[PDB]
């Protein structure tokens, strides 16, 4: 029956995918369908965008729905339809498969009485939202995204896999409007909760690596730069030509060397126009970073407009325009004195903490520790008698 169809796909397949094909025949017969789940994963990794995949899954989907794991079956379909370039094909396939599942669970959930099929509904649904973002329907996708989110929250536990699919619909939506900041934050959520399992390629990771860095440079408040270098995405992608100078910019921003950033960006701005249309922002971005960072590393909280002028390489006019932007952005709050030529900073925004910063703060605690101990020595000595 199915024994014949596996055999015709096999003949048509490359001899690359032949030894993997065999395992499907053996396991089906022996009825050892856990080793069946392993074989399908193995097969799919190196044959993702082959046309034997989609055909093959069609056979299997019709036969089992609850004789192998619900989580396992649906994730195969999602990776398939990403790679399917006919988007119409995707929208149709999804709706029919979801319906089946909805009908299936009235009877199956109770008979097995330990297996749930309503986790499958969600896994599918995330992809229905993605498929509209391919046909460039923002309205339709947004409606599904508010609903996906409320469902997520209702459960008292989430699998990794569901919340992954949820951050994926999200990511593609935000980057169409071309909103940088909104994108960056989302992507962090997706990266952490991700599976160990490779069903995500190097290509995807590297594409996300390129988008996240664009977002951080062309951003206006992302000082989580250090987080990319201390997180695998950007740390291990350094090795292509693109990701040498890109990596460096981020290293430049932190230490605040204005020369290094400037020099590298002149060469690269021609080649890539995404940086080129946000240039006003890009050039000011490093200036914003040094302005907040000087305040942090000083104990006190006030700077002369003379100091600021040196540090950013700006005139006194443009020093004042720079503090005013920064406040407007909400990096700094305080007061501006033009008649004492001070900025008296009153709050600085939190930020991440690296090794260096750890010690800086540590040292300041040392003085205040002493002040408590000796002030307390004076109080011991007066009214030593009265302590009743």
């Amino acid at each position: 029956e199915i024994d014949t169809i596996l055999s015709t796909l096999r003949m048509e397949a490359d001899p690359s995918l032949h030894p993997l094909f065999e395992q499907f025949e053996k396991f089906y017969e022996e009825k050892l369908w856990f080793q069946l789940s392993e074989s399908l994963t193995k097969f799919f990794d190196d044959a993702k965008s082959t046309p034997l995949r989609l055909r093959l899954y069609d056979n299997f989907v019709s036969k089992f729905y609850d004789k192998i794991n619900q989580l396992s079956v649906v994730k195969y379909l999602l990776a398939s339809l990403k790679d399917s370039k006919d988007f119409d094909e995707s929208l149709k396939y999804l709706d029919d498969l979801k319906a089946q599942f909805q009908e299936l669970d009235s009877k199956k959930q109770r008979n097995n009485g330990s297996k749930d099929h309503g986790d499958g509904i969600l896994l599918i649904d995330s992809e229905i939202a993605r498929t509209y973002l391919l046909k460039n329907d923002l309205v339709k996708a947004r409606d599904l995204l508010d609903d996906l989110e409320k469902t997520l929250d209702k459960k008292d536990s989430i699998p990794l896999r569901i919340t992954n699919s949820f951050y994926s619909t999200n990511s593609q939506y935000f980057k169409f409007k071309n909103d940088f900041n909104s994108f960056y934050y989302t992507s962090l959520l997706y990266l952490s909760t991700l599976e160990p399992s490779t069903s995500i390629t190097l290509a995807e990771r590297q594409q996300l690596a390129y988008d996240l860095s664009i977002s951080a440079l062309l951003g206006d408040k992302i000082y989580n730069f250090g987080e990319l270098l201390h997180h695998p995405i950007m740390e291990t992608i350094v090795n292509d030509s693109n990701y040498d100078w890109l990596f460096q910019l981020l290293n430049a921003l932190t230490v605040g060397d204005f020369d290094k950033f400037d020099s590298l960006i002149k060469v690269q701005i021609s080649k890539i126009p995404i940086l080129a249309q946000h240039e006003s922002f890009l050039r000011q971005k490093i200036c914003l970073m040094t302005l907040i960072e000087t305040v942090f590393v000083k104990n006190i909280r006030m700077l002369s407009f003379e100091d600021i002028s040196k540090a950013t390489h700006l005139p006194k006019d443009n020093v004042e325009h720079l503090v005013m932007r920064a406040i407007s952005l909400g990096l700094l709050k305080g007061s501006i004195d033009q008649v004492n030529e001070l900025v008296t900073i009153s709050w600085v925004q939190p930020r991440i903490i690296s090794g260096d910063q750890i010690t800086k703060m540590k040292d300041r605690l040392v003085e205040w520790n002493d002040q408590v101990e000796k002030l307390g020595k004076k109080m011991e000595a007066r009214g030593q008698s009265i302590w009743v």
Binding site: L189, T193, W347, I353, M361, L365, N369, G376
Partner: protein
């Protein structure tokens, strides 16, 4: 109320909880006062354990809230109340690692029935030196507060020391409040700290 409970100390990964008892027991709670439902569990201390993460699962099929973890320290240690209180949360970790299940701190305070409150005072006969009364009492509390500050602050310096020499993992969430200690920090010689002197001269 107690539940029958066994904890194995050789291997900490084996424990006894009787699920049958809890339902029965809850029914009899309704006899007493039927405004009571299961909202968590007490632990006997002296501290948090990471085997408490596994116990916690079982009590999610009882409750209508995220279950309560209350350390009742039975040896009564701490410079304030001798209870810490935590609640189980599931969350993504932003230091690039997967979704953990973790116990995040909830502050402890007390409120009591009016009736209970006259009994507490009734058994007791201390004059108190950790609550405020007269002048002399408040001097004793003044000194206690300052030495309290000394104790906690010392612990911060040595905590910082551990990350970069013993290698506790950086946790951005904790150190982030310590930055705000600096920005809300008082300053000397500002027109605020001179109002501070002028008010002393008034009083």
């Amino acid at each position: 109320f107690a539940l029958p409970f066994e904890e194995d100390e050789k291997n900490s990964d084996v424990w006894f909880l009787d699920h049958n008892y809890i339902e029965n027991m809850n029914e009899m709670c309704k006899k007493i006062n039927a405004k009571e439902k299961l909202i968590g569990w007490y632990h006997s201390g002296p501290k948090l354990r990471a085997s408490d993460l596994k116990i916690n699962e079982l009590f999610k099929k009882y409750t209508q809230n995220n279950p309560l973890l209350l350390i009742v320290d039975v040896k009564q240690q701490g410079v304030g109340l001798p209870t810490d209180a935590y609640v189980a949360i599931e969350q993504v970790k932003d230091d690039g690692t997967s979704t953990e299940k973790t116990f995040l701190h909830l502050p402890c305070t007390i409120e009591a029935e009016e009736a209970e409150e006259i009994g507490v005072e009734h058994l007791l006969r201390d004059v108190r030196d950790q609550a405020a009364g007269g002048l002399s009492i408040r001097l004793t509390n003044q000194l206690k507060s300052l030495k309290g500050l000394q104790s906690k602050l010392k612990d911060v310096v040595e905590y910082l020391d551990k990350v970069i020499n013993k290698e506790l993992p950086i946790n951005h969430t904790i150190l982030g409040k310590l930055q705000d200690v600096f920005n809300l920090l008082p300053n000397l010689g500002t027109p605020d700290d001179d109002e501070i002197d002028v008010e002393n001269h008034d009083r």
